[PDB]
């Protein structure tokens, strides 16, 4: 069997305001819920400490099928091991995969990942915009069926990705983006970001049954410089080339590169740098056997449009995506729009993606 990454999130350094509420992670247990795409019977999970400056010390990890919110089906709970060990402690900047574990993972299903921490500092790697409630209880409760009075926090910590073993040809679509991809305005706990809607359509169609979708969106992200979280260029290798089975990359990013410009000259400079960055990413993906699909968008909100040079430059970017011939194909969301992000808009976007782009090889 070969590994395929079925779920991912893009890690970053957690800002102070996005650290969990009391009692905190230190010495406590955190239960987190994710939606997988392709299913299977043998799994492994990777945890990331990539952006922290302190060690990540974990006493135990389990996986289970959720029942309702913070509870799990007790008969499904399985412990992870790390080179046989219950626990791990990994250096600043490192990550770790669990050993393989037998686990019946249904496609398009929710998985509860429960982590019991040792000492945790204020320097933590995670994904704040989870769009999903996580649950904290005191002490070591990795295998507790029912969490009593858990503290709720709508953030993810430590997670990176889940891989499944496959026997049939199976491949992943990775999606690099900002908050439009990460799911701003999607429904909390609903797992209804546009990549989830697209993922469900792949799984419901026989010719794309073995195609997973990896959400590498980060809210506020920029491609070239600035923004929130590591830039797309800086996280490209770690997020896109570091998974299992990636065959396609969708790029939906760049608006924030222009949204922060304050004069027309800087807007022009950031537009040129963004177009150069697209080519660097296309070339890197091609070198690794990955096709790249460029996605257009119209900027959301009013703050982008209060200075007119921004939209005039953004129209040039959309035109380059459409007409430069550098992308292997184009997903023209902007044109479809013209025919604030929210759940209905993500349903529309997810239904628009052409499944025929995910069928060759
Ligand atoms: Cl969660
Ligand atoms: Cl994903
Ligand atoms: Cl954003």
């Amino acid at each position: 069997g070969q590994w395929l990454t079925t779920w991912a999130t893009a890690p970053q350094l957690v800002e102070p305001k996005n650290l969990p509420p009391e009692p905190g992670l230190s010495g406590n247990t955190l239960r987190q819920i994710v939606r997988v795409s392709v299913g299977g019977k043998k799994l492994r999970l990777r945890f990331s400490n990539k952006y922290s400056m302190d060690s990540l010390a974990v006493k135990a990890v389990s996986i289970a099928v959720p029942s309702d919110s913070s509870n799990v089906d007790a008969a499904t709970i399985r412990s992870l091991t790390f080179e046989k060990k219950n626990n791990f402690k990994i250096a600043p900047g490192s990550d770790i995969y669990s050993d393989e574990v037998n686990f019946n993972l249904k496609p398009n299903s929710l998985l509860a990942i429960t982590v019991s921490y040792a000492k945790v500092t204020q320097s933590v790697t995670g994904h704040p915009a989870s769009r999903t409630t996580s649950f904290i209880v005191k002490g070591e409760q990795t295998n507790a069926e029912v969490f009593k009075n858990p503290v709720k926090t709508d953030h993810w910590y430590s997670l990176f990705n889940i891989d499944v073993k496959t026997s049939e040809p199976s491949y992943a679509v990775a999606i690099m983006g900002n908050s439009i991809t990460d799911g701003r305005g999607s429904g909390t706990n609903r797992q209804n970001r546009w990549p989830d809607i697209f993922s469900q359509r792949l799984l419901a169609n026989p010719s794309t049954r073995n195609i997973s979708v990896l959400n590498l969106g980060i809210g506020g992200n920029c491609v070239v410089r600035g923004g929130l979280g590591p830039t797309a260029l800086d996280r490209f290798d770690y997020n896109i080339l570091n998974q299992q089975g990636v065959k396609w990359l969708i790029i939906l990013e760049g608006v924030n590169d222009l949204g922060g410009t304050r004069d027309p000259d800087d807007a022009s400079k950031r537009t040129e740098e963004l177009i150069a960055a697209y080519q660097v990413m296309i070339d890197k993906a091609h070198a690794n056997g990955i096709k790249v699909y460029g996605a257009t968008i119209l900027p959301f909100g009013k703050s982008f449009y209060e200075k007119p040079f921004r939209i005039e430059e953004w129209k040039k970017v959309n035109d380059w995506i459409r007409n430069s011939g550098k992308f292997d194909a184009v997903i023209d969301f902007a044109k479809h729009m013209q025919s604030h992000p929210n759940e209905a808009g993500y349903r529309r976007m997810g239904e628009f993606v052409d499944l025929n782009l995910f069928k060759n090889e």
Side-chain angles (χ1 to χ4, degrees):
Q2 286 198 87
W3 290 116
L4 171 74
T5 305
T6 185
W7 171 87
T9 190
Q12 71 164 76
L13 178 66
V14 176
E15 310 89 338
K17 56 160 167 206
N18 287 326
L19 290 167
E22 256 66 41
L25 300 180
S26 267
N28 293 330
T29 294
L30 175 72
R31 176 161 292 164
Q32 304 181 88
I33 311 298
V34 308
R35 175 196 160 271
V36 305
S37 60
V38 171
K41 302 286 190 253
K42 298 189 165 264
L43 266 52
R44 67 179 184 169
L45 283 80
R46 179 161 54 181
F47 304 88
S48 179
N49 199 36
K50 170 74 165 170
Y51 299 99
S52 313
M53 308 208 324
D54 300 317
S55 280
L56 172 63
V58 161
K59 299 192 180 175
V61 184
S62 71
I63 58 173
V65 179
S67 45
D68 279 326
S69 64
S70 57
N71 310 324
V72 298
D73 180 346
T76 70
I77 305 168
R78 301 297 188 269
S79 293
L80 306 189
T81 58
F82 301 89
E83 295 301 332
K84 304 183 186 301
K85 313 296 178 58
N86 300 40
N87 64 301
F88 69 74
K89 185 193 166 194
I90 64 177
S94 295
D95 39 55
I96 191 174
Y97 262 114
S98 72
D99 304 335
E100 310 183 27
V101 66
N102 295 293
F103 187 93
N104 182 39
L105 184 75
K106 289 183 172 103
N108 196 33
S109 71
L110 300 182
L111 184 70
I113 304 162
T114 308
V115 173
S116 292
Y117 292 92
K119 178 222 189 339
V120 182
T121 72
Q122 315 288 108
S123 188
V124 177
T125 297
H127 186 95
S130 60
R131 328 298 178 188
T132 310
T133 309
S134 299
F135 306 95
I136 300 172
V137 293
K138 288 214 172 53
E140 301 185 42
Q141 304 196 38
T142 336
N143 305 304
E145 175 184 356
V146 174
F147 269 17
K148 190 183 190 93
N149 304 307
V151 169
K152 294 174 179 170
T153 186
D154 295 347
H155 300 302
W156 285 329
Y157 305 94
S158 314
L159 306 185
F160 190 6
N161 59 284
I162 297 157
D163 300 347
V164 295
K165 281 294 199 93
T166 64
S167 34
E168 297 190 349
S170 305
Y171 318 96
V173 186
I175 307 177
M176 169 85 73
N178 56 26
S179 84
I180 304 318
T181 295
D182 192 14
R184 182 168 64 87
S186 69
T188 301
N189 301 320
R190 303 290 169 89
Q191 311 286 350
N192 66 2
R193 317 164 190 82
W194 81 258
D196 288 297
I197 303 305
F198 162 53
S199 171
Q200 289 159 352
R201 293 174 57 236
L202 289 162
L203 297 165
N205 169 50
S207 58
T208 49
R209 207 74 92 171
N210 302 333
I211 306 305
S212 58
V213 179
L214 311 183
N215 191 323
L216 287 307
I218 295 183
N221 208 234
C222 285
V223 174
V224 173
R225 186 163 57 252
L228 304 185
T231 65
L233 286 176
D234 287 350
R235 71 201 175 91
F236 190 90
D237 302 349
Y238 187 61
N239 287 183
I240 308 305
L241 302 182
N242 191 25
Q243 314 296 344
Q244 299 291 315
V246 178
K247 183 153 217 94
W248 308 270
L249 169 64
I250 302 172
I251 302 183
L252 182 60
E253 205 177 329
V255 163
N256 294 326
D257 292 70
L258 275 63
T261 60
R262 65 185 274 176
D263 52 79
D265 285 332
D266 199 42
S268 166
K269 177 174 172 293
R270 291 304 295 265
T271 292
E272 295 158 356
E273 286 161 4
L274 174 62
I275 287 158
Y278 285 159
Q279 192 69 66
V280 166
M281 307 190 277
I282 293 161
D283 290 348
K284 276 193 176 183
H286 284 174
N288 290 267
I290 295 165
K291 288 166 82 173
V292 189
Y293 300 149
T296 63
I297 207 80
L298 307 158
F300 286 101
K302 301 320 154 181
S303 166
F304 186 96
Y305 301 90
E306 76 203 350
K307 285 295 192 132
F309 54 76
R310 293 199 278 257
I311 196 52
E312 176 248 359
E313 291 293 329
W314 187 253
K315 295 166 82 143
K316 288 174 190 343
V317 176
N318 272 348
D319 185 76
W320 189 91
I321 295 166
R322 285 177 185 122
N323 300 316
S324 70
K326 299 302 190 182
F327 285 105
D328 296 297
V330 173
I331 299 164
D332 203 343
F333 288 128
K335 190 158 271 273
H336 193 56
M337 285 163 183
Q338 302 164 301
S339 305
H340 300 291
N342 66 26
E343 289 163 280
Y346 289 146
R347 186 185 66 235
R348 288 199 283 282
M349 288 182 69
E351 298 173 337
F352 175 73
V353 182
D354 180 8
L355 301 195
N356 286 336
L357 296 168
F358 309 95
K359 292 180 193 173
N360 193 315
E361 283 155 35

